[PDB]
């Protein structure tokens, strides 16, 4: 057990297509799944989950290979990993549609599930990452202020396990720089939180898994070139950070190419790590979006 489980929640595992997936579940009612992104685990949702649980059954899986979940047996591309996450959600909501909230590469691993099974999805929240498509080839390698937002795409995807080799042994050094490079609010990342995240992803198979999601990114882009011929039909909300390290207006502008029904918000002075940097206003937005009209 890597992270504190909130009161009222359990920690559990389910096997899905031969892969043992760790998740954290609590609450009662219609299902909401929350999928974390790179450098983190289910724990980033730990302040949202109690609030959502008042009204929904909340499930927060660890991505395959990260946290306490086994690596995938098929592959790391978006379409393959979405199979694991879709089957997991559906174990818990076989008869009714469920809600999905995703952050960072959580988006990469849920988009194919969402687009191919639209009737299963009631509402969708995506924050702080591009859906894999050709727009990621337009991000700069370098800026007039220093390092750019996503130069790590090339670092993590490079051959000869370049990223693993250079980071092994120095995991906490790297993760703290990566988190703070992408943050506006550095305060909320205490020594304890940084340590907990560094321990999890420093597990040799978890460090490797992290980068496989990137080594599959170009394959995801190809997959989504075909899937994106069908627009998303469920009400959708995008959240992006407006401060240093966030995606700004890019999150909504991209989603105008995907969603029939999109609401967008840019949170001022917040970076990439929305649940931690700007917990209160992000929680308010997500709670209100999933509760309106219900």
């Amino acid at each position, epitope marked *: 057990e890597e992270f504190p489980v909130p009161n009222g929640f359990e920690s559990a595992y389910r096997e899905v297509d031969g892969v043992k997936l760790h998740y954290v579940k609590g609450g009662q009612g219609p299902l909401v799944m929350l999928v974390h992104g790179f450098g983190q685990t289910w724990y980033e949702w730990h302040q949202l989950m109690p609030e959502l649980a008042k009204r929904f059954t909340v499930i927060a899986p660890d991505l395959p290979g990260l946290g306490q979940s086994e690596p995938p047996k098929t592959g790391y591309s978006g379409e393959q990993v979405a199979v694991y996450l879709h089957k997991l959600a559906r174990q818990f909501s076989p008869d009714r549609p469920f809600d999905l909230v995703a952050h960072d590469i959580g988006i990469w691993n849920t988009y194919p599930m969402v687009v191919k099974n639209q009737a299963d999805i009631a509402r969708l929240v995506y924050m702080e990452a591009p859906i894999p498509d050709a727009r990621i080839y337009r991000f700069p390698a370098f800026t007039a202020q220093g390092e750019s937002l996503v130069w790590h795409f090339s670092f993590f995807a490079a051959d000869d396990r370049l990223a693993e080799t250079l980071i092994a042994g120095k995991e906490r050094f790297f993760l703290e720089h990566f988190i703070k490079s992408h943050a506006s609010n550095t305060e909320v990342f205490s020594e304890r939180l940084l340590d907990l995240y560094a321990r999890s992803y420093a597990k040799p198979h978890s460090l490797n898994a992290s980068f496989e999601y990137y080594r599959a990114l170009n394959e995801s882009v190809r997959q989504n070139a075909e899937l994106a011929k069908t*627009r998303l039909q469920m*009400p959708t909300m995008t959240l992006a950070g407006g401060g240093h390290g966030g995606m700004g207006t890019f999150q909504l502008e991209q989603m105008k190419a995907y*969603a*029939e029904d*999109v609401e967008g918000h840019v949170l001022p002075g917040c970076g990439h790590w929305l649940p931690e940097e700007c917990a209160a206003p992000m929680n308010r937005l997500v709670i209100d979006f999933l509760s309106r009209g219900r």
Partner: nanobody
Amino acid sequence: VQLVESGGGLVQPGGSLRLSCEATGNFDDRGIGWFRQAPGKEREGIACITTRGRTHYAESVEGRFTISTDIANNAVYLQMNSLKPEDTAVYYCAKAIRLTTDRTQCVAFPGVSWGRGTQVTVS
């Protein structure tokens, strides 16, 4: 383009008119809006419907126009009642987005190519 307008014409103020927007092929994506362009101003989104059925109306047509989707006949209709001189414009339908930022509006899907349109004149 792949949505064709029809139904426009000359009506007297206070009269009615039903515009239709017809699919030329596949009709899986029914997130469609109605746009009008006056000869002086610039094109404006006035009503849209998503495939799941959510509608939005611009304030200037709220309560007077009704957008609906007829799946059987691959069409989206725009029922216009209590027409007035201002409503005079060219009316276009295109693939659309129901966009909420600080308010909800109908916007065109990026990069759509517009078609002939259908002319509505109220006097």
